[PDB]
């Protein structure tokens, strides 16, 4: 299976109306069997719909979707989008993290995580949850630490140890310094393997920051990842793009991994 987490900047109508930018997104989304698209600011799911119109064009089932509601603590709001190939995997259950109270998701996260239970019939792990997080860069250390209590919650709900956590964690540069990694349970505990290292560059910008990360917990899931497959995919280098053109698609790179 090949899965990515891509933060596509201001994914929305305008963006998806521009046929050159849409072509590119389509070419990038098609590499993956499960891709998480963050920063979906699409009030009426028009751009998600247009994207899907592109993907499902000659087989109405090349991709199915899972999408949350606008999330954010009453401000700018964005959606989490999971698109998958239903012939490769299946979503058994989904939920949006909250704590034990309805306002409560938002006490620990600005865009409270969506977690999805997949069945994979092609890989050694046969069942696993993906939890998505796009952190709010000023709250990044705290959120990525709270992501550990969401791993706990998925184990208590779904009796699932195999948990892949991924997204634009803002987990580098000025939002998370070397010294602050000791405050992040998610990283401190040996339960978790960080597949995108700190040296990576996952920003399309001239910054060198491992903003976007993929974490895997559970020994079965840790055994399914193909070693050396987790990387940012640099579409600018891949499709021989100019700077301008590459940033028009996004200021981030998809971070992908392969499971077997």
């Amino acid at each position: 299976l090949k899965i990515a987490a891509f933060n596509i900047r201001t994914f929305g109508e305008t963006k998806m109306s521009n046929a050159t930018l849409a072509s590119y997104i389509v070419r990038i989304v098609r590499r993956y069997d499960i891709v998480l698209i963050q920063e979906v600011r699409d009030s009426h799911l028009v751009a998600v719909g247009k994207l899907l119109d592109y993907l499902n064009q000659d087989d109405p089932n090349t991709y199915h979707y899972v999408v949350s509601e606008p999330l954010g603590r009453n401000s700018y709001k964005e959606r989490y989008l999971f698109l998958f190939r239903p012939n490769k995997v299946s979503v058994l259950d989904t939920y949006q993290y909250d704590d034990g109270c309805e306002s409560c998701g938002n006490d620990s996260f600005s865009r409270e995580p969506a977690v999805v239970k997949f069945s994979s019939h092609s890989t050694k792990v046969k069942e696993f949850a993906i939890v998505a997080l796009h952190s709010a860069p000023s709250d990044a250390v705290a959120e990525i630490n709270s992501l550990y209590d969401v791993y706990l919650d998925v184990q208590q709900k779904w009796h699932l140890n195999d948990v892949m956590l991924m997204g634009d964690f803002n987990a580098d540069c000025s939002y998370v310094t070397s010294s602050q990694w000791s405050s992040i349970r998610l990283r401190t505990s040996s339960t978790f393997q960080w597949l995108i290292p700190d040296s990576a560059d996952t920003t399309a910008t001239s910054t060198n920051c491992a903003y976007d990360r993929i974490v895997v917990a559970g020994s079965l899931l840790q055994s399914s990842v193909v070693p050396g497959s987790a990387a940012p995919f640099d579409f600018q280098a891949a499709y021989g793009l100019s700077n301008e053109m590459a940033l028009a698609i996004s200021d981030h790179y998809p971070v992908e991994v392969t499971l077997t």
Partner: protein, 374 residues
């Protein structure tokens, strides 16, 4: 002792209004659209939903093929109308249709057959105990506490003039002007896009309707207004787009509803509201006419604009024979008048007699047999 509660549904081209007999306002107001998922998938706390109706359909419209089942007051697609009625009882109203008498409203000059397919879905599919179907405009008038007047009712997809005398609409003096709310919102989007503003996204286009409802108004004398705006700034108002960038319109504000008086502005070679009202009254019997000019009631969402009442007053007076006491009555709650009407009637114990029950339906339902005044 509380009597078993009837429901009132008013299914308009843009909005369904629904609720309980006795209340002052529809407990439910949602748009009249049905949407089917263009693609398979799921919302995060949710099971795959096969269809959406109302707010939900418009919130997610980007991934649905939307359907509008009521075209200009008339039910056009009966399958999607079942989805709506269905939604109204079980989701919105939270009732079991089997134990509540439902009163439904209909358009002026609604096809005899349609009223019947409506009677049949209620009884056959919704198994309503007893049910009534009233004409939208009569309900607005009775809601004014009266049984004689002429009504202008202007919604989202149709506008009608309806003379009613002693409680029944006078069928061939009814005028139908195919111009209402949606046309005005589109005209305002026309105006503002000429002016270099763009409303391209769904969110952006959605808000035009709101500047419409907020800042548009009817000039008592279009021509003078037009001069005021050319020389001042007093008529100008701004509005913040959802994206923080602002909008500032000034003459636009009375230009868009002016379409109701001068359909010229949207290329609609047809007559305007004031004259449609006049012409209906002239098809009436010359004795009731005095009463019509004095009980000229306004009804509907497009009837909302500030100023509109004064221009109907003025325009009909310069057209009406010099001794007629013209009275334009515009109720504060008039965007809900039909529903309110429907509630008020359904509440009277008297009305329990006119209510057709499924028992009567063992003996078929012909209902309409349409009629006179010309």
């Amino acid at each position: 002792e509380e009597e078993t509660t009837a429901l009132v549904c008013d299914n308009g081209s843009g909005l369904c209004k629904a609720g309980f007999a006795g209340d002052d306002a529809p407990r439910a107001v949602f748009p009249s659209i049905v949407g089917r998922p263009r693609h398979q998938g799921v919302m995060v706390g949710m099971g795959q939903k096969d269809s959406y109706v109302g707010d939900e359909a418009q919130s997610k419209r980007g991934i649905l093929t939307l359907k509008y089942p009521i075209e200009h007051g008339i039910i056009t697609n009966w399958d999607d109308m079942e989805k709506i009625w269905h939604h109204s009882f079980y989701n919105e109203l939270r009732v079991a249709p089997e134990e509540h008498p439902t009163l439904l409203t209909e358009a002026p000059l609604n096809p005899k057959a349609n009223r019947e397919k409506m009677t049949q879905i209620m009884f056959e599919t919704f198994n309503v105990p007893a049910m009534y179907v009233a004409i939208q405009a009569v309900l607005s008038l009775y809601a004014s506490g009266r049984t004689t007047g002429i009504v202008l009712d202007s919604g989202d997809g149709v506008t009608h003039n309806v003379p009613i005398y002693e409680g029944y609409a006078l069928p061939h003096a009814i005028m139908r002007l195919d111009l209402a709310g949606r046309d005005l919102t589109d005209y305002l989007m026309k105006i503002l896009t000429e002016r270099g503003y763009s409303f391209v996204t769904t969110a952006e286009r959605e808000i035009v309707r709101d500047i419409k409802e907020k800042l548009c108004y009817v000039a008592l004398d279009f021509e003078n207004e037009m001069a005021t705006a050319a020389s001042s700034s007093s008529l100008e108002k701004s509005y913040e787009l959802p994206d923080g960038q602002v909008i500032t319109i000034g003459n636009e504000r009375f230009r868009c509803p002016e379409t109701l008086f001068q359909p010229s502005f949207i290329g609609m070679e047809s007559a305007g509201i004031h004259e449609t009202t006049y012409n209906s009254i002239m098809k009436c019997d010359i004795d009731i006419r005095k009463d019509l000019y004095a009980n000229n009631v306004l009804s509907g969402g497009t009837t909302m604009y500030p100023g509109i009442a004064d221009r109907m007053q003025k325009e009909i007076t310069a057209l009406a024979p010099s001794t007629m006491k013209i009275k334009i009555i515009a109720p504060p709650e008039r965007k809900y008048s039909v529903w309110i009407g429907g509630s008020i009637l359904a509440s009277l114990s008297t009305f329990q007699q006119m209510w057709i029950s499924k028992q009567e339906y063992d003996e078929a339902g012909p209902s309409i047999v349409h009629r006179k005044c010309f």
